[PDB]
């Protein structure tokens, strides 16, 4: 009976909306028994099968729906969503374009296609497709919120106030009606949502993982209660999609090797395949055990593998970022599970026990913002591998082209050896600073830069144009290897003025909001002899920032844009700036470490979210509390003072340059020991039969 099957299908659509996915599946299946050739039911069943992670089975049913009904546009668009999740972008594109070819007025298909454009980096096209979707279906939370994120990426602040109001309205309505918020947890920090909303958004996304592990029907795992089977060693497993050329490896790649093999056995669980970089080689070589879970796509089998290794503490380095397999944590194969380093926020999830943070980043009085218990590292939870990756930047020299520390810079592993070969190096007190006078050698270096030559040879030493590192050694440029040559970096390479203050910020532009640019405008207005240095990150955001700046009263030539650079050049060119102005909305995190390694003071204003407080935690560990502002007023005054009181700038820059070495900030050895102590407090607490509690001391 058609009427019987219809009722089953329609009831299943209702169960689905209510979050009862298992019951939905049951009813779609009953519908198909009654009426086997029921296209709508095949397509709808396939949608919930996708939600349970049964992708191949979903594809089978979409194809069956389309065989039955060749112009079934819903089935094509839904099938594309499945193909997208399987990383078959071409297949998804073919489905969406077919669906729109069938029904040009199909809003969902326009929004789904826009998501491809967005993920491919084609923001103007994503924006155009999202706008079409919204024209067709004005009430469309997914399209609206993804559109708002596109606009954020390119700094389009048109009707920004109304935009924020609507985003919060949408999230409020979705949370009240028990639906999945269209704002992604990782983006929630960018909008004026309450802390309550932000935790709930994270919590509901974590519950998606549960839908996928419930179908597995696995019993709880039995966890070890002693270290006997591991000979007294604590077994730590690090789980990451980012073992390879990714910011996460640029921060912690040294840590697995620095764990004490007497007290710790380290397991690294890669969620990604080998990208062939030295980052991946290193972690694979230095971890006690390296397990490629990208070869075990079934989450049940992967979790089983983790459990069979006997892991005591399992560490989630992804959170809600691309490549995550949080289903592994939802299965709970380890007694203690902790969030660490990779994701700047709470999981909001029952299945994570601890978040590894610090007092500055996550003060006890805001513990309500987190679903995990706070586990404090003693200084900052943040770490970077800069001392290992870029030791060529530990020392520098300059050329007296007239003395400036940041107009024409030379760095190198072999720098001192080269300076010896010279009979006229002046040493200036400010360690100290070697200055090469304007002689024949200095002229040859400067001519290299002016002529855009790749490299020259002086007294047998190779001296490189800093813009040409990839042509000389591609591994040195990515940070996979330490450069061997003496490298030259100049303000002239980036069109920076030789005789003015350079304020920098090298973050992705999405971190900038109107309030932020206004603050920067004010600073520049008060330091007449100054520019702001930003990146084309992405390039299409540049004319927007320029418009809004001009609108705030700044001529165009006060803001200088540079392309995004290879990792090594990005860190090295930070030495050319006087001061970095951190973004209060979401701080530089990796980018903050990058700037400080260069010796560049960073002005920050910590907010209420974890992501807005990281730079202050880095600065506190570094020992520069004078760079941390308590409000916008102080941020502007600190920045203006650094730009106008040149003796104070010299002092503070010297303080950063010295303390990047003497403070614990870049000390991976000390960091690992402190992390090990925290791991133990976690373990002894559990071994004494206790549930997780704040480790804040």
């Amino acid at each position: 009976c058609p009427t019987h099957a219809d009722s089953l299908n329609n009831l299943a659509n209702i169960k689905r909306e209510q979050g009862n996915i298992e019951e939905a599946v049951r009813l779609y299946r009953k519908a198909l028994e009654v009426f086997p050739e029921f296209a709508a039911a095949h397509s709808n069943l396939a949608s919930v099968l996708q939600q349970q992670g049964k992708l191949q089975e979903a594809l089978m049913h979409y194809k069956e729906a389309i065989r039955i009904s060749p112009t079934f546009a819903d089935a094509y668009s839904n099938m594309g969503n499945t193909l997208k999740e399987m990383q078959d972008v071409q297949g998804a594109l073919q489905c969406y374009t077919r669906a729109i070819q069938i029904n040009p007025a199909f809003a969902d298909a326009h929004s789904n296609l826009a998501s491809i454009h967005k993920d491919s980096g084609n923001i103007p096209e994503a924006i155009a497709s999202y706008r079409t979707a919204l024209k067709l279906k004005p009430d469309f939370p997914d399209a609206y919120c993804n559109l708002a994120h596109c606009l954020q990426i390119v700094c389009d602040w048109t009707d920004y106030d109304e935009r924020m109001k609507k985003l919060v309205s949408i999230v409020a309505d979705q949370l009240e009606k028990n639906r999945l918020p269209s704002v992604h947890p990782h983006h929630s920090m960018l909008y004026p949502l309450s802390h309550g909303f932000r935790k709930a958004i994270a919590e509901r996304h974590g519950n998606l993982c549960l839908d996928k592990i419930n179908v597995l029907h696995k019993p709880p795992y039995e966890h070890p209660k002693d270290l006997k089977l591991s000979d007294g060693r604590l077994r730590v497993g690090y789980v990451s999609s980012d073992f390879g050329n990714h910011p996460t490896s640029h921060l912690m790649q040294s840590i697995p090797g620095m764990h004490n093999p007497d007290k710790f056995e380290v397991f690294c669980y890669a969620l990604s395949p080998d990208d062939g970089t030295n980052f991946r080689v290193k972690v694979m070589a230095e971890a006690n055990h390296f397990i490629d879970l990208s070869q075990i796509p079934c989450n049940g089998k992967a979790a089983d593998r983790i459990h069979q290794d006997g892991i005591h503490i399992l560490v989630n380095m992804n959170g809600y970022t691309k490549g995550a397999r949080n289903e592994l944590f939802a299965l709970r194969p380890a007694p203690i599970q902790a969030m660490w380093l990779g994701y700047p926020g709470t999981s909001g999830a029952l299945f994570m026990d601890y978040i590894i943070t610090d007092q500055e980043t996550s003060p006890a009085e805001v513990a309500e913002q987190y679903s995990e218990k706070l586990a404090y590292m003693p200084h900052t939870f943040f770490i970077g591998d800069h001392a290992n990756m870029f030791p060529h930047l530990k020392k520098k020299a300059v050329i007296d082209f007239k003395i400036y520390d940041n107009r024409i810079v030379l760095n190198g592993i072999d720098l001192k050896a080269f300076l010896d070969s010279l009979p006229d190096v002046k040493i200036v007190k400010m360690l100290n600073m070697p200055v090469i006078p304007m002689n024949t050698i200095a002229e040859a270096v400067i001519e290299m830069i002016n002529r855009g030559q790749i490299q020259i040879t002086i007294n047998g030493f190779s001296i490189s144009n800093g813009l040409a590192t990839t042509q000389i050694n591609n591994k040195a440029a990515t940070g996979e290897e330490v450069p061997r040559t003496i490298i030259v970096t100049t303000r002239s390479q980036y069109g920076l003025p030789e005789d003015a203050i350079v304020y920098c910020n090298f973050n992705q532009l999405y971190k900038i909001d109107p309030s932020t640019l206004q603050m920067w405008a004010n600073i520049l207005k008060r330091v007449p002899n100054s520019v702001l240095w930003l990146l084309r990150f992405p390039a299409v955001g540049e004319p927007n920032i320029q418009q809004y700046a001009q609108n705030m009263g700044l001529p165009q030539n006060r803001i200088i844009f540079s392309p995004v650079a290879p990792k090594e050049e990005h860190v090295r060119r930070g030495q050319l700036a006087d001061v970095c102005l951190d973004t209060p909305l979401c701080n530089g995190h990796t980018t903050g470490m990058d700037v400080l390694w260069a010796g560049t003071p960073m002005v920050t204003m910590p907010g209420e979210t974890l992501a807005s407080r990281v730079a202050a935690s880095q600065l506190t560990c570094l020992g520069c509390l004078e760079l941390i502002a308590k409000n916008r007023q102080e941020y502007e005054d600190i920045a203006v003072k650094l730009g106008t009181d040149l003796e104070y700038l010299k002092k503070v820059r010297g303080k950063v340059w010295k303390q990047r070495i003497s403070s614990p900030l870049f000390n991976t050895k000390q960091y690992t020991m402190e992390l090990e102590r925290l791991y133990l407090q976690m373990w002894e607490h559990y071994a004494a039969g206790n549930k997780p509690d704040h480790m804040i001391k």
């Binding site: 299908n9 397509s43 996708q50 594309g80 993920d119 269209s182």
Partner: peptide, 12 residues
């Protein structure tokens, strides 16, 4: 990875 929207088809 940007989320997508599944379309539910009602039987009539």
């Amino acid at each position: 990875e940007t989320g997508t929207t599944n379309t539910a088809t009602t039987a009539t």
